[PDB]
Each structure stands twice: as C-alpha cells, then as structure tokens.
Design an enzyme around this catalytic site. Structure first.
Site, PDB file in Angstrom:
ATOM      1  N   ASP A   2       0.831  -1.205   0.000  1.00  0.00           N
ATOM      2  CA  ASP A   2       0.000   0.000   0.000  1.00  0.00           C
ATOM      3  C   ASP A   2       0.871   1.263   0.000  1.00  0.00           C
ATOM      4  OD1 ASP A   2      -2.868  -0.870   0.296  1.00  0.00           O
ATOM      5  OD2 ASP A   2      -2.272  -1.502   2.331  1.00  0.00           O
ATOM      6  N   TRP A  47      -5.431   6.444  -5.041  1.00  0.00           N
ATOM      7  CA  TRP A  47      -6.171   7.689  -4.879  1.00  0.00           C
ATOM      8  C   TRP A  47      -5.228   8.843  -5.216  1.00  0.00           C
ATOM      9  CZ3 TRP A  47      -5.774  12.094  -1.943  1.00  0.00           C
ATOM     10  CH2 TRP A  47      -4.912  12.100  -0.848  1.00  0.00           C
ATOM     11  N   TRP A 247       5.687  -4.323 -10.162  1.00  0.00           N
ATOM     12  CA  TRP A 247       4.776  -4.832 -11.164  1.00  0.00           C
ATOM     13  C   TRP A 247       4.954  -4.138 -12.510  1.00  0.00           C
ATOM     14  CZ3 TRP A 247      -0.635  -5.427  -8.405  1.00  0.00           C
ATOM     15  CH2 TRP A 247      -0.640  -6.605  -7.660  1.00  0.00           C
TER      16      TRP A 247
END
Ligand SMILES: [Ca+2]
Ligand SMILES: [Ca+2]
Length: 445
Positions: A2, A47, A247
C-alpha cells in the site's frame, strides 16, 4: 503493498489509502509504527489528490476542518476531475461537498493529482495539477471555486504526474520555491523519478532558475514521490518518500503478476543547499528516526584496497557508512549482499573514469526480464577524489545517498537470503576506506 502519502496535522502524521472501494486511515507519531484507525469514507468511487487543514475557516466548514481535494471520474464521461470532501472531526471521517466537481475537466485526458497549498503571502489557496506535459496552476479563496492562473510547460520528460509545490529556506538564509513532479526522462537518458525546479512563485506562475530540472533520485525506482512538512518544529527541512514499483517491470503477454506489487522507499529528510551563485539543490538523507532500529554496529579500521577486500561480516538489513578517497583509479565501491561464491552481489560505487556514481543490480535478483534497467547512473565530478556513502540495504531494496545527498539512487534489488557478505572493490588503482560502519537494522517494511 500500500503506497503511503503522509500529511501532518493535529499532532500526528496521517495517511489515507484505498482498500477494496473504501478509504482507510492510518496514523503515526514517528513515521515507523502506523496504526490503522478505521474507515474514513465508507464508499469511494491509487487515490489522487491532497489533504489540507483549513485553519482560518476559508471554506465555511469551521476553523481547523480537514479538506481533501481528490481526482475522481466524472459521472457523465468518466473524465478526470477534482472533487471536495470535508471532515469536521479532525480527519476521522469525510463527507462529499455536493455532487459536482470543484474543478471540472476541460475536455482533456490528463487532469489529475491536485497538490493544494496555502499561499500565506497572497492570502489564497493554490493548486498545482498534472495536465499531461504541463503543470496547471489554479487559485481559490475558499477551496470550492477555482480559477486558472498559468501553466508550467515541461520539455522532453514525458507525462508529468503528482506535482509538488513548496517553499524552503536554504542554508544561506535565502528562501526558494520548488516545483516538483514525477516524470519520465528515459528518452533523453534521464531518470523516471522526481524532477524539480528551484525558482520563484508569485501566486500565479512559477519561474524556474533554469530550464532543465534537477532530479531528487537517479535510481530506477522512486516514483510518485511526495514531500511533507516536519511536524516536530517547517522551512528548514521536509520529509519525502516514493513508491518502488515491481509490477510495472512485467514484460510478458499473460497478465498474471506475483504478490509483490512494490514497496515504499525509506523516508528521507530533504534540505535546500546553496551550491554557489544562484545555484541551489535539494540534499537528501535517511530520516534520523531510523537509528532506533539499530540492533548492533560493526566498525572498521582504515582499509587500503587494490582490487578487492572482503569484510569478515554477515549483513542483510543495514545502514552502511564510509568515506573513500583515491588518486588515479577507474572505479571504486562496494559489493553488497555478496554470495559466498562471490558470483552474486549488488554494486554501489563511483566511476572516476566515467564521471558518475552507480548502482548495478545486474549480478543479483532484479525485476527487469529484458536486462535493460541494470545500472543507475548520476553525474559525479571526475576531479573529486573522495566521497561519503550512506547506503540502506534491505531484502528488496538498496537506497544509496552520496555525500550530502544531492544525488541519491533508489533501486529494487532481490538478493538471496543467504547472500550476506560485503567486499570492497577498486579497478585500476588503490583506494582508502575510512570510518566504515555497518549498523544492522530491524526491517520495518
Ligand atoms: Ca518506471
Ligand atoms: Ca512506467
């Protein structure tokens, strides 16, 4: 897993994060131990935006209300636009201001990541917005009604994201503004990290000291960087951190990906240094909080090196510090996380011949299946024949700070668990390593 975008208010550091859907809230006193505090928004349509404290009640929610300006898709066309959310309970929970954006999309694809600051001198809010290759500036008296003031057009650094705007006092006592943004200069052989311009901001437009940006990191892996205020004081020092994206290196046709999406960098402190003339640079160093993770320390005598010197040590997660000096060599540095057979290692050093500092991950686990992104490089004066290194090594990352940290390299690197040696190295000449210290650290990440 996160990404964190911290902000200091009401005595603590906070961050909010999407969790699938809902906006969650975490808090910290030290930027070590984050404690989740629950759901701040039960239903939210990474966000994108900023959180501010409206101390003087400009927006009408009360003195000290917490206001978030966030990018979301428009209900009509899904286009990026900016919406206001407010909290009157110290940032515990937020509600939406109406249903309309406070700044609507002007029919463009890139229109995101509002960075909102209070400009005390101009007595107004200012928003810096990512708008493709330009950063847009908007002014507001009250956070709700915005007016375009100007655009700062970048050149040859790709798409701009996550702009930043702040004021610092340099060590000479001069205040400068800094405009920053994530960018992608790979087409010109420049970094894909955080570009910045020292300069001047008048409330409407940003005037850079020089057209070409400086880069806050020269590693491969320091994206979506954010800076935030030091709460335990604001102009002399700021904190920063960024995302290290694993990623995004995937380069196969199937879309599956491993569980490791990426990791936050360490938190750094940044200061503004005068380098002579009208030249200023940001200088980076690991936060001092990190020393409370020290388990033990190994210190070394002065060491002369020609070729190789292997340390009698096992080190996995640690801060290494050293001073090095030399004469006519080609390169010098450290082989970190070295295997017993000496075939695997992470190399950090200086190329005196090439005029650059480097971190090479080509001999360890590394994320790029094409083997393009192996050795990060940053300018280093070939006439300077001494250097100080501060290097943070952890299981998935190496973060190297050179001298006062005008140049830093942050890189993903994946050593084997049992590859724990350290060898010092030179090529074509002798060097002296002094004040070498290894501080073994507990890993937070
Ligand atoms: Ca990248
Ligand atoms: Ca990319």
């Amino acid at each position: 897993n996160d990404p964190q975008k911290p902000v200091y208010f009401n005595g603590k550091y906070h961050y909010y994060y999407l969790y699938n859907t809902e906006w969650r809230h975490a808090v910290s006193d030290d930027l070590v131990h984050w404690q989740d505090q629950g759901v701040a928004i039960p239903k939210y349509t990474p966000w994108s935006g900023s959180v501010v404290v409206d101390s003087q009640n400009t927006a009408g929610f009360g003195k000290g209300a917490i206001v978030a300006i966030m990018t979301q898709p428009s209900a009509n066309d899904g286009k990026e636009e900016q919406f206001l959310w407010y909290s009157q309970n110290g940032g515990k929970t937020f509600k939406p201001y109406g249903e309309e954006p406070v700044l609507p999309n002007p029919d463009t694809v890139d229109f995101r990541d509002p960075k909102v600051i209070w400009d005390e001198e101009d007595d107004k809010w200012v928003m810096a917005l990512a708008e493709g290759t330009k950063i847009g500036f908007y002014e507001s008296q009250n956070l709700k009604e915005w007016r375009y003031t100007s655009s700062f057009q970048t050149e040859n650094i790709g798409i701009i994201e996550c702009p930043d705007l702040f004021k610092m006092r340099a060590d000479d006592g001069t205040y400068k503004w800094v405009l920053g943004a994530s960018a992608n200069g790979k087409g010109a052989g420049k970094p894909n990290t955080y570009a910045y311009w020292t300069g001047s901001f008048n409330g409407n437009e940003f005037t850079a000291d020089e057209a070409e940006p400086q880069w806050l990191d020269h590693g491969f892996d320091w994206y979506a960087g954010v800076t935030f205020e030091d709460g335990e004081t604001s102009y002399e020092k700021r904190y920063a951190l960024a995302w290290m994206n694993n990623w995004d290196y995937a380069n196969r046709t199937p879309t599956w990906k491993d569980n490791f999406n990426g990791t936050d960098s360490i938190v750094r402190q940044i200061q503004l240094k005068h380098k002579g003339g009208n030249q200023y640079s940001l200088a980076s160093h690991p936060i001092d909080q990190l020393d409370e993770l020290t388990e033990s320390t190994d210190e070394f005598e002065r060491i002369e090196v020609n070729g190789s010197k292997t340390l009698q040590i096992k080190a996995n997660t640690y801060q290494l510090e050293a001073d090095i000096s030399w004469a006519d060599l080609k390169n010098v540095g450290f082989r970190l996380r070295e295997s017993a057979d000496r075939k695997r290692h992470i190399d950090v050093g200086i190329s005196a011949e090439g005029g650059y500092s480097f971190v090479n991950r080509g001999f360890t686990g590394q994320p790029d299946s094409t083997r393009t992104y192996l050795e990060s490089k940053a300018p280093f004066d070939p006439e300077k024949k001494r250097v100080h290194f501060t290097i943070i090594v952890d299981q998935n990352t190496v973060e190297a700070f050179i001298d006062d940290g005008e140049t830093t390299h942050s890189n993903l690197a994946f050593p084997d668990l049992n590859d724990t040696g350290i060898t010092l190295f030179t090529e074509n000449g002798t060097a002296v390593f002094e004040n070498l210290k290894i501080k073994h650290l507990r890993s937070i990440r």
